[PDB]
Every structure is written in structure tokens, then in C-alpha cells.
Amino acid sequence: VQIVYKPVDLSKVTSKCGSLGNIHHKPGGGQVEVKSEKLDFKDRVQSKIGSLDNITHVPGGGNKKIETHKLTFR
Amino acid sequence: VQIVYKPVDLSKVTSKCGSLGNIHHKPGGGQVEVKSEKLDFKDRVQSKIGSLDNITHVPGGGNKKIETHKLTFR
Amino acid sequence: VQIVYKPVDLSKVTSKCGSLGNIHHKPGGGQVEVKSEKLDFKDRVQSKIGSLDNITHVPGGGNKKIETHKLTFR
Amino acid sequence: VQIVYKPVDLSKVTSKCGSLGNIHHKPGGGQVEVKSEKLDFKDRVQSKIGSLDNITHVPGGGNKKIETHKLTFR
Amino acid sequence: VQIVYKPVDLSKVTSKCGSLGNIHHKPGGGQVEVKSEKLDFKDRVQSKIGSLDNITHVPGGGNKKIETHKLTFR
Amino acid sequence: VQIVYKPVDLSKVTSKCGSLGNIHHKPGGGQVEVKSEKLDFKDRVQSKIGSLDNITHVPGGGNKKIETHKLTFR
Amino acid sequence: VQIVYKPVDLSKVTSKCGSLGNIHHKPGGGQVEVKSEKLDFKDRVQSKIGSLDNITHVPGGGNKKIETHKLTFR
Amino acid sequence: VQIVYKPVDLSKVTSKCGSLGNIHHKPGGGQVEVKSEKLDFKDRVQSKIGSLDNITHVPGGGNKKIETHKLTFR
Amino acid sequence: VQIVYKPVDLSKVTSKCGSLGNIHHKPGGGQVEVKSEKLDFKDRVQSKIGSLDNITHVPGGGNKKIETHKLTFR
Amino acid sequence: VQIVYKPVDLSKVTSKCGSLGNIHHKPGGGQVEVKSEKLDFKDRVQSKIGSLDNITHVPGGGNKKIETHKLTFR
């Protein structure tokens, strides 16, 4: 029983951008009304209730590598 | 019983952009009204209830590699 | 019993863009009204209830490679 | 019993675009009214209920390769 | 019992576009009214109920390769 | 020269209504596009140019008497 | 030369309404686009140019008497 | 030369309303775009240019009498 | 030359309303864009340019009498 | 030359209202953008340029009498 785990990974992620100019985020907010009474969350819940919200994201490169290696022997 | 796991991966993701000009995000917000009473979430729930929301995303390159390697021996 | 897993992968994703000009996202928001009483979510639910929402996405290259390698021995 | 998994993959995805000009997304929002009482979601549900929503996507290249390699030995 | 899996794949997807001019997406929204009471979704449901929605997509190249390789030995 | 102006006017306008029930005015608006260059209005002009508009009028009685008495001696 | 101006006016306007119930005015607005360059208005002009507008009028009685008495001696 | 101006005016305007119930004015606003360059108004001009606007009027009685008496001796 | 101006005016305006209930004015605002360069107003001009505006008027009785008496001797 | 100006005016304006209940004015504001360069106003101009504005008026009786008496001897 011989298991050889040898992932040869050569990877490059490259973003080339000269200049990012005028980014204008001007939002006139509104109205959010939320009515509830009983909220039950047990395990690993991500919940946003009644949000007015503004996200301006300007990453120079925004590159993301996700690598998962799982080996299980039963 | 011999298992040879040898994924030779050579990968390149390349975005070339000179300049990003005028990005204008001006939204006049409105009205969101949500009525509930009983909310039950058990396991691994992602829930957005009653949101007014504004996302401006300007990544220079926006490149994303997702690589999953799973080996299971039963 | 010999299993040789050798995926030779040479892949390139290339986006070349000189300049991105005027992107104008101006939306006049409206009205969203949602009435419920009892919401039950058990496992791995993604749910958006009562959203008014504005997404401006301007990636320089927007390239995404998804690679899944699964080997199972029973 | 010999299994040789050797996918030689040479692939290139190439988008060449000089300039992207005026993109104008101005939508006058309307009205969405949704009435329900009892919602039950068990496993792996993606549900959007009562949304008014605006998506402006201008990727420089928008190239996406999806590669799935599955080998199962029973 | 010898299985030789050797797909030699040489593939190129190429979009050449000089300039993309005026894209104008101005839609006057209307009215959507949806009435239900009991909704039951068990496994792997994708459901949109009561949406008014606006999608402007202008990818520079919009090229997508989908490759699935499945080998099963019983 | 004798002018006797004696209009004996006895007038009654009567509207009897018990109850006015559900009046529902929900119109999905559309699009109006009007192009002109030179507009000249001299005396007593009433002009509506490029209107999208919604009028809900529910008067309890809506009674209107118009009485004009003109006597001219030359 | 004798002018007797004696208009005996007895007038009653009567609206009787018990109750006015549900009046619902929910209009999804649209888009109005008006292009002009030169507008000249001299005397007593009433002009609405490029309006999106919503009027909900619920008068209890809405009764209007207009009475004009003009006597001119030349 | 004898002018007798004796308008005997007995007038009553009467609105009787028990109760005014639910008046709901919820309008999702839209978009108004107006382009002009040169506007010239000399005498007694009433002009609305580029308005998005919402008027909710609920007078208990809304009764209006307009009476004009003009006598001119030349 | 005898001018007798004796307008005997007996007038009553009466609004009787028991109770005014739920008046709900919730408007999701939109977007108004107005472009001009040169505006010339000489005498007695009433002008609204580029307004987004919300008027909720609930007078208990809303009764208005307008009476003009003009006598001119030349 | 005898001018007798004797307007006998007996007038009553009466609004009777028991109670005014829930008046709810919740407006989600939007966006107003106005561009001009040269504005010339000479005599008696009333002008509103670029306003977003909210007026809630709840007078108990809202009764207004306007009476103008003009006598001119040339």
C-alpha cells in the first residue's frame, strides 16, 4: 500500500494595470423597514437582517487562488 | 496497490489593462419593507433579509483560480 | 493494481484591453414589499428575501478557471 | 489492472479588445410585491424572493474554463 | 486489463474586437405581483419568485470552454 | 332706458353615496421620449410636453356649478 | 338710464358620504426623456416639461362653485 | 345715470363625511432626464422643468367658492 | 351719477368629518437630471427646475373662499 | 358724483373634525443633479433650482379666505 501525493503546481496570476481613474460612488440612501419577532439560529449561520450599506472596493489587482488538497485513508 | 498522484499543473492567468476611466455609480435608493415573524435556521445558512445595498467593485485584474484535489481510499 | 494520475495541464487565459471608458450606473430605486410569517431552512440554504440592490462590477480582466480532480478507490 | 490517466491539455482562451466605450445603465425601478406565509427549504436551495436588482458587469475579457476530471474505481 | 486515457487536447478560442461603442440599457420598470402561501423545496432547487431585475453584461470576449472527463471502472 | 337684471336662481346639487370601497390604481409606467428644439409660446398657452403622470381622484361628491352673468351696455 | 343689478342667488351644493374605504395608489414609475434647446415664453404661459408625477386627491366632498358677475357701461 | 349693484347672494357648500379610511400612496419613483440650453421667460410664466414629484392631498371637505364681481364705468 | 355698490353676501362653507384614519405616504425616490446653461427671467416668473419633492397635505377641512370686488370709474 | 361702497359681508368658514389619526410620511430620498452656468433674474422672481424636499402639513382646519376690494377713480 503505497500512496504518492506529489502535485507539482506552478501557477502565476498576473494583473497589469497602468492607472485607475475617477471612481465615483455617490448613492442617495433610502429606507429599509424589517419587522420580525422570533429568530433562532443554531449552527454556522451567516445572516444580515435590516442593512443599508455601501461598499466601495478598488483593489489594485484583485487576484485570489483557492487550493484545497484532501487525502483520507480509511 | 500503488497510487501515483502527480498532477503537473502549469497555469497562468493574465489580464492586461491600460487604464480604467470614469466609473460612476450613483443610485437613488428606494424602499424595502419586509414583514416576518418566525425564522428558523439550523445548519450552514446564508440569508440576507431586508437589505438595500450598493456594491462598487473595480479590481485591476479580477482573476480567480479554484483548484480542488481530493483523493479518498476506502 | 496500479493507478497513474498524471494530468499534464498547460493552460493560459489572457484578456488584453486597452482602456475602459465611461461606465455609468445610475438606477432610480423602486419599492419592494415582501410579507411572510414562517421560514424554515435546514442545510446549506442561500436565500435573499426582500432586497433592493445595485452591483457595479468592472474587473480589468475577469478570467476564472475552475479545476476539480477527484479520484476515489473503493 | 493498469489505469493510465494522462490528459495532455494545452488550451488558450484569448480576448483582445481595444477600448470599451460608453456603457449606460440607467433603469427606472418599479414595484415588486410578494405575499407568502410558509417557506420550507431543506438541502442546497438557492432562492431569491422579492428582489428588485440591478447588475452592471463589464469584464475586460470574461473568459472562464471549467474542467472536471473524475476517476472512480469500484 | 489496460486502460490508456490520453486525450491530446489542443484548443484555442479567440475573440478579436476593436471597440465596443454606445451600449444604452434604459428600461422603465413595471409591476410584478406574486401571491403564494406554501413553498416546499427539498434538494438542489434554484427558484426566483417575484423579481424585477436588470442585467447589463458587456464582456470584452465572452469565451467559455466546458470540458468534462469521466472514467468509471466497475 | 330701464334694464332690470333679476335672475332668481334656486338650485341644489345633491350627491348621496353610502360608502366607496376598494379603489386600486396600480399602473406600470412606460417610456416617453420627446425631441424638439425651438418652442415659442406668446399668450395664454397651457402646454404639457413629455409627461408620464398618474392622477387618482376620489371626491366624495364631485359637484361643480359654473354660473356666468354678463351684462354690457354700449 | 337706470340699471338694476339684483341677482337673487340661493344655491346649495351638498355631498353626503358615509365612509371612504381603501384607496390604493401604487404606481411603478417609468422613464421620461425630453430634449430641447430654446424655449421662449412671453405672457401668461403655464408649461410642464419633463415631469413624472403622482397626484392622490381624496377630498371628503369636492364641491366647487364658480360665479362671475361682470357689468360694463360704455 | 343710476347703477344699483345689489347681488343678494345666499350660498352654502356642505360636505358631510363620516370617516376616511386607509389612503395608501406608495409610488416607486423613476427617472426624468431633461436637456435644454436657453430659457427665456418674460411676464407671468409658471413653468415646471424636470420634476419627479408626489402629492398626497386628503382634505376633510375640499369646498372652494370663487366669486368675482367687476363693475367698470367708462 | 350715482353708483350704489351694495353686495349683500351671506355665505357659509362647512365640512364635517368624524375621523381621518391611516394616511400612508411612502414614496421611493428616483433620479432627476436637468442640464441647462442660460436662464433669463424678467417679471413675475414662478419656476421650479430640477425638483424631487414630496408633499403630504391633510387639512381637517380644506375650505377656501376667494372674493374679488373691483370697481373702476374712468 | 356719488360713489357708495358698502359691501355687507357676512361669511363663516367652519371645519369640524373629531380626530386625525396616523399620518405616516416616510419617503426614501433620491438624487437630483442640476447643471447650469448663467442665471439672470430681474424683477419679482420665485425660483427653486435643485431641491429635494419633504413637506408634511397637517392643519386642524386649513380654512383661508382671500378678499380684495379695489376702487379706483380717474
Folded structure, characterized:
- The structure is a homodecamer of 74-residue chains.
- The first copy, chain A, is mainly β and 74 residues long.
- In chain A, 0% of the residues lie in helices and 72% in strands.
- Chain A contains no helices and 7 strands.
- The interface between A and J is small, with 6 and 6 residues.
- The PDB classes it as protein fibril.
- Keywords: Amyloid, fibril, Alzheimer's, disease, protein fibril.
- The assembly is decameric.
List keywords for this structure.
protein fibril, flat, 74 residues, homodecamer, mainly beta
Structural topology:
Ten copies of one chain form a homodecamer.
Chain A: E1 2-5, E2 9-20, E3 23-25, E4 31-35, E5 38-43, E6 46-57, E7 63-73
Modified residues (N6,N6-dimethyllysine) (chains A, B, C, D, E, F, G, H, I, J): 6
Modified residues (Omega-N-methylarginine) (chains A, B, C, D, E, F, G, H, I, J): 44
Organism (chains A, B, C, D, E, F, G, H, I, J): Homo sapiens (Human)
Number of DSSP-assigned strands of chain A:
7
Query: Biggest sheet of chain A: strands, sense, closure?
Result: none
Radius of gyration of chain A: 23 Å
Q: Termini distance of chain A? A: 12 Å
- Structural class of chain A, by secondary structure, is mainly beta
Note the beta-strand portion of chain A: over 45%
Largest interface pair: A-B, 74 and 74 residues
Global morphology of chain A: flat
Helix content of chain A: under 10%
Order of helices and strands of chain A: EEEEEEE
PDB class: protein fibril
Keywords: Amyloid, fibril, Alzheimer's, disease, protein fibril
Assembly: decameric
Entry title: Tau Paired Helical Filament from Alzheimer's Disease not incubated with EGCG
